[model samples]
Target: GSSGSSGRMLDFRVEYRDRNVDVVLEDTCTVGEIKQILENELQIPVSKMLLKGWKTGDVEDSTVLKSLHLPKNNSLYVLTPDLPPPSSSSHAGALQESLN
Candidate 1:
C-alpha cells in the first residue's frame, strides 16, 4: 500500500564512518521511519539517531524526511557514539560532573 506522498521511490545512501548502506524507499516515508531502518541495520537504538541538515534545527522524530527538503540523491552519516548523548543525560548528576 502507498504511504504519505505519491511518487517514484527514491534512492539514498546512509554513510556511517567507513560503511555505506544503500536504501531505496518512497518519498512518503517519514524521518522516524528512516531512523527505524538505520536502527535495524546499524544496531543503534532509535533514540541514538540524530538526523542532520534540517533547516529547523533538530526536528521531532515524527517529522517526514522528504518534507525537510533534503537532497533527492545524497548521503547521510550516522553520528558517532563518542559525541555527547542527547539532552536526556542532562538530568544525571554523574553526567553533569563529567561535562565540567
Candidate 2:
C-alpha cells in the first residue's frame, strides 16, 4: 500500500549506466523527492546518485522543478560511483592442511 498523488505531471528520460528509465513526475516535485522515487524503483541509493543533465544548470536535491525553466519532456542522467558488489557465500567443507 502506498499513499500517492500527482498533478501537472512531467515526463523524464533518465539514463543510468547501460540502462534507461522513463518516469512521470509532478511539476512541483523537488529533486530530492524525484531521487527518492528513483531510489525506490531502481534500488539505487539517494546518497550515491548524481542526478545531472538539467537544462537550467546544476541541481541539488532540494531544487524544485518549478523554480527552473523546463519543458514537459525532460532529459536527465544519473552517475553513480563504482561500488564493490556485496560479498555472498555459503558452504561447508572439511579441510586438512600441513604446516611447514
Candidate 3:
C-alpha cells in the first residue's frame, strides 16, 4: 500500500543520453540529494552528472527545489562526461573482407 500525496511531492523526469527516467522528489529535497538518487539508478558518478534545465541559472548542489520555485512537473537533462564513445564491431566483419 502506497501513501497518497498530501504533502509537497514534485514529479520530475530526467533525460540521460537517450534514456528518460522518472523521479519523485519533495520541495525540501536538495540538488545533491537528487543527484545521489540519479547516480544510484543510472550508475553514473554524481560528479559527472551535470543537471541542466533549471529555472534558475547556475544552481548549486546545496540548493533546494523550493528555493528554485519549480513547478509540480519539471523536466531536466543530465549530461555525463568521460563516457566512452560507442564503436562499431568492425573486427569480425572486416576480417572476412581481408581474407579474400
Candidate 4:
C-alpha cells in the first residue's frame, strides 16, 4: 500500500530491458518505495535498477519527488548491470552442483 496521497494521480512508466509497467506514483512515495513496488511486482531488486530522469542519473531510494514541478505523466527508465531470465533453472542446477 502507498503511504499517502491527496488523491492526486501519480502515473509513470518503469521500463527495464524489454519489460515495462505503467504505475501510479504516490505523493509520499520515495524512489526506494517505488522501487519496492516494482521489485515486488517484477520480482527484481531495486539494487539492480538504474532509474533515469531524476536530476541524479542514479537515484537513491531516499530521494523524493514533489507534486510541484513534476510532470503529469513521467517515464523512468531502468538501466542495470544485469538482470536474469534463465536463472530459474540455474537455481536448481547450482544447488546440485554445490552438492556434488
lDDT of 1 by residue, 3-100 (tens): 89567565567876647887666767886677778777777776666656444777677877668766667566677565454453375444444543
Model 2 lDDT, residue 58, Cα: 77
lDDT agreement with native, every candidate:
0.67, 0.74, 0.78, 0.67
Q: Per-candidate RMSD vs. true structure?
A: 8.0, 8.9, 8.1, 5.2
Give the residue spans of candidate 1 off by over 4 A.
1-6, 82-100
Off by over 4 Å in 3: 1-6, 86-100
| Per-residue accuracy of model 3 over 1-100 as CA lDDT, tens digit each | 7677555887779987758898888888897777888887888777777878888777888888878878888888888776544354435333344532
* Candidate 1 residue-wise lDDT at 23: 67
Residues 1-100, model 4: lDDT tens digits: 8777464557778777758888786666776677777777777777886667765456666667662335778777677776554343453333334632
Evaluate residue 45 in candidate 2 and report its C-alpha lDDT on the 0 to 100 scale: 82
| lDDT measured at residue 44 in model 4 versus the true structure, 0 to 100 | 72
Distance (Å) between predicted and true CA of 56, model 1? 5.4
User: Which of candidates 3 and 4 reaches a greater lDDT?
Assistant: 3
* Model 4, TM vs. native: 0.66
Local lDDT at 59 for model 2:
77
- Looking at candidate 1, what is the lDDT of residue 26? 74
Summed backbone clashes in each candidate are 0, 0, 0, 2
* Superior by TM-score: candidate 3 or candidate 4: 3
Best by TM-score: 3
